[PDB]
Design an enzyme around this catalytic site. Structure first.
Site, short mmCIF file in Angstrom:
data_model
loop_
_atom_site.label_atom_id
_atom_site.label_comp_id
_atom_site.label_asym_id
_atom_site.label_seq_id
_atom_site.Cartn_x
_atom_site.Cartn_y
_atom_site.Cartn_z
N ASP A 1 -5.55 9.07 -0.46
CA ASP A 1 -5.32 7.68 0.59
C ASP A 1 -4.10 8.49 1.32
O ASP A 1 -3.09 8.75 0.69
CB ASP A 1 -4.94 6.31 -0.17
CG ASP A 1 -5.99 5.87 -1.07
OD1 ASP A 1 -7.21 6.06 -0.49
OD2 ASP A 1 -5.95 5.47 -1.98
N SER B 1 -10.83 11.92 -3.58
CA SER B 1 -10.47 11.53 -2.32
C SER B 1 -9.09 11.33 -2.48
O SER B 1 -8.42 11.05 -3.55
CB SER B 1 -11.15 10.39 -1.99
OG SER B 1 -11.02 9.23 -2.71
N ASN C 1 -8.40 6.11 3.20
CA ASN C 1 -9.04 6.97 2.18
C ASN C 1 -9.88 8.03 3.02
O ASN C 1 -10.57 7.82 4.08
CB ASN C 1 -10.05 6.10 1.33
CG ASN C 1 -10.81 6.89 0.35
OD1 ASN C 1 -12.15 7.50 0.58
ND2 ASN C 1 -10.14 7.15 -0.67
N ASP D 1 -15.49 -3.27 9.10
CA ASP D 1 -16.44 -2.84 8.41
C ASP D 1 -17.09 -3.62 7.55
O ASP D 1 -17.93 -3.06 6.53
CB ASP D 1 -16.06 -1.38 7.76
CG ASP D 1 -17.01 -0.54 7.38
OD1 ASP D 1 -17.59 -0.28 8.36
OD2 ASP D 1 -17.15 -0.17 6.29
N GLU E 1 0.91 -1.23 -0.05
CA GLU E 1 -0.01 -0.12 0.10
C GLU E 1 0.85 1.19 -0.09
O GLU E 1 0.65 2.25 -0.87
CB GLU E 1 -0.82 0.06 1.17
CG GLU E 1 -2.28 -0.90 1.21
CD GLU E 1 -3.02 -0.53 0.08
OE1 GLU E 1 -3.11 0.60 -0.32
OE2 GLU E 1 -4.04 -1.41 -0.16
N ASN F 1 -6.85 9.95 -5.67
CA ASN F 1 -7.82 9.30 -6.45
C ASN F 1 -8.41 10.40 -7.41
O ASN F 1 -8.65 11.49 -7.10
CB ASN F 1 -8.56 8.44 -5.52
CG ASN F 1 -7.97 7.69 -4.54
OD1 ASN F 1 -7.20 6.69 -5.19
ND2 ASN F 1 -8.13 7.60 -3.50
N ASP G 1 -11.57 10.34 -7.89
CA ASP G 1 -12.82 10.65 -7.40
C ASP G 1 -13.01 11.92 -6.38
O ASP G 1 -13.80 12.12 -5.83
CB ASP G 1 -13.36 9.34 -6.84
CG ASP G 1 -12.64 9.20 -5.29
OD1 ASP G 1 -11.51 9.17 -5.46
OD2 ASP G 1 -13.24 8.62 -4.51
#
Length: 129
Positions: free
Chosen positions: A52, A50, A59, A101, A35, A46, A48
């Site tokens: 990380d 957002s 995120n 989650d 990662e 990203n 979109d």
């Protein structure tokens, strides 16, 4: 800060990640390696809107507030900048919520693509844990 492999393993073990939710330490070290390559300052924007953050690439759309992500939630109740410290405490505690989650470690795409189903024990080799 860039952790050494065993150095990070120790730190994670210390924060209770070994076997957390049934995921062996190797899984976490492997996830961190792919990662962010063990770099706490790692960030990836990203498409979109957002971003990380940190060693575990958490995120901003749902877990931390970076003040520039549309319709973002702050479920971990922390600024994303806290996820970029040399102290992984913040990332681990938030990670503990993400893995629970409802998707297991599948929440981390790199873990899914490069660690899932492999011999993750190798990532803990040479470590005096």
């Amino acid at each position: 800060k860039v952790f050494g492999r065993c150095e990070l393993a120790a730190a994670m073990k210390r924060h209770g990640l070994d076997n957390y939710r049934g995921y062996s330490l190797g899984n976490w070290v492997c996830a961190a390696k792919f990662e962010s390559n063990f770099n706490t300052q790692a960030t990836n924007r990203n498409t979109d809107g957002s971003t990380d953050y940190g060693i575990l690439q958490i995120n901003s759309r749902w877990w931390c507030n970076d003040g520039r992500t549309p319709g973002s939630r702050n479920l971990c109740n922390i600024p994303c900048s806290a996820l970029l410290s040399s102290d992984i405490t913040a990332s681990v505690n938030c990670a503990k919520k993400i893995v629970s989650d409802g998707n297991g470690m599948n929440a981390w795409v790199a873990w899914r693509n490069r660690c899932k189903g492999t011999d993750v024990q190798a990532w803990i080799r040479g470590c005096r844990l």
